[PDB]
Amino acid sequence: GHIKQLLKNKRFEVIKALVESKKIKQEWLEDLYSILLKQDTDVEITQAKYEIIKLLLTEKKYLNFELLTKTLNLDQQTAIEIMRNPFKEVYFPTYNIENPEESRLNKALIIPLSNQTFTLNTFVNSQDLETIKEATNKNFFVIFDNIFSGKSYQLAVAAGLIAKEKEILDNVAFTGEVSSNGFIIPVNHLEEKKEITEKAKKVLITPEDIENLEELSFWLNPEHLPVIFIHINKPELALQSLKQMEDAIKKDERFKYFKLENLKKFYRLEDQDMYLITPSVDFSNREELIKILNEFREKVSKLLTLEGVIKDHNKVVLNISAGISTLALYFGVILGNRQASIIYHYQKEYHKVIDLTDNPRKIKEKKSEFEKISVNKNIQDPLMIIIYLASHNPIEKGLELKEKLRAKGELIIQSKEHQGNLEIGDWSDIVSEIYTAIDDNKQKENYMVFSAPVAIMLALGMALGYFLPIKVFHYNRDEYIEVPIKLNEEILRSPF
Question: Is there a single domain that holds both residue 401 and residue 472?
């Protein structure tokens, strides 16, 4: 036949190019399958094998069990799994010291199997694949698109076996060896491999980033992937604050493997994707505020979708804090109360105060008897809401604003058996009781001032939503000024 004639003349490049054209007759298949058994004596044979396999897996009209079982001597079940199980392609760079011109970012094609591990590349040591099998507890088939020395591919192959989605493997390469117990073993020429990988517009993961497969699975197969959004006032504290948020996240046993640099590499985030800096906010300027809220919308949207790599949005945990309580209220309204999130209160460091990962409704759940707050009220239609949960006592200026606005009603909320600054702890019950007092007493029109930690007003905004007719007044050092965005405006509708 045609392939048989091309074979007798060892024109493997012509066979590969013809396979890449996907114009193959069925009478050619038997001779094409026989290529897979030939010795990998030169790179053109190995690359022909790779394209032949990739053709069979992507155009399954060429996938044939007779040839798989009769030519490759595969048992039936291994044959069946080759043609049904989805494959994963992973990238790994190699550096040749003698011939640096043949250094390359290579590919490994991996298919999970039940009870057999093998490769079609004759230059590969079988014991090196058994190590991957033991570390992952998974049998597999693997084939490579290049001839190379060493076993620095083991991390990439382990990644292809562990990753549930292929999207995370499109932009990330790996170098490193794997031990039988799943530990990542150092490799050489990390700097040359880094250049090779970035020339191909990918990011390289090395043994200096990942220590074992459990850590790798934390990023490739996340159950609760932590992302960060912090609002801050000073730009010179941006990077340091991200590190402090990283410190607080790592104190959680569920996130002991979290590293800022690994979140950035695996999910293609930069520092600015995780912060919002406002050096000075004029809360009387509507267009200036809308600009900030638009940036918050764009940043949180990227953090919760992550370019589609994450399929279930419930697997992402938003670790969030802010630096102005008035702004945090509007952030909370837009963020909504259906996202897995953890709210932190900053005081020398980031303190977890409200964990919404198990139940995002807990900041909205009403209780018959207030345990955390005291409520004094005289409910009339123009209702003034005053929240007193910090050292500054806003009640007097709030009642003076009430009389200036001709408001007839007042709802005064303050801490129960506590004075001034709230003790750091679980603040979810405080928020739910505030929400209960507002939801049970809200009127046709309402005004609201507040002296409360940033984390309290963030959660309160998430609880209230954009449903309530509340005009917010911001404390500008010495006086209350109306924020020119009503809490029920359509621009505050949560998109998440």
Answer: yes
CA distance readout (Å), 177 to 21, 23, 123, 146: 35, 39, 17, 18
Question: Judging by DSSP bridges, how do beta strands 470-476 and 445-451 pair with one another?
Answer: parallel
Type and span of the H or E element at 411: strand 409-415
Tokens 């197969």 found at: 221
Are residue 343 and residue 385 in the same domain, yes or no?
Answer: no
Sequence-distant (6+) residues with CB within 8 A of 119 are 126, 129, 141, 142, 143, 144
Residue 11 in 3-state DSSP? Answer: coil
The length of the chain in residues reads: 496
From the list 181, 209, 189, the residue with the least C-alpha distance to 149 is 189
Q: Facing residues of 89 across strands?
A: 109
CA distance 299 to 270: 11
Domain assignment of residue 195, given as a range? 85-221
CATH number of 191's domain: 3.30.230.10
Tokens of 208: 């200096």
Last residue of a domain, one of 321, 355, 389: 355
HSE-CB for 265 with a 13 A CA cutoff: 22
Q: Are residues 318 and 433 in the same domain?
A: no
Partnered with residue 350 across adjacent β-strands are 346
- Asked if residues 452 and 418 have their Cβ atoms less than 8 Å apart, the reply is no
Residues 66 and 96 in one domain: no
Distinct helix (H) and strand (E) counts, the chain: 17, 19
Single-letter amino acid code for the residue at 183: F
Q: How many structural domains is the chain composed of?
A: 4
Q: Judge if 435 and 457 occupy the same domain.
A: yes
For residues 318 and 304, give the distance between their C-alpha atoms in angstroms, rounded to a whole number. 8
Yes or no: say if 224 and 256 are a contact pair by the CB < 8 Å rule. no
Evaluate whether 324 touches 277 at the Cβ level (below 8 Å): no
169 with 90: CB under 8 angstroms? yes
Would you tell me how many other CB atoms lie within 10 Å of the CB of residue 436?
19
DSSP assigned state of 423: P
Domain shared by 324 and 196, yes or no: no
Residue 420 Ramachandran class (φ > 0 left, ψ -120 to 50 alpha, else beta)? left
Q: Which residue has the tokens 């790599």?
A: 309
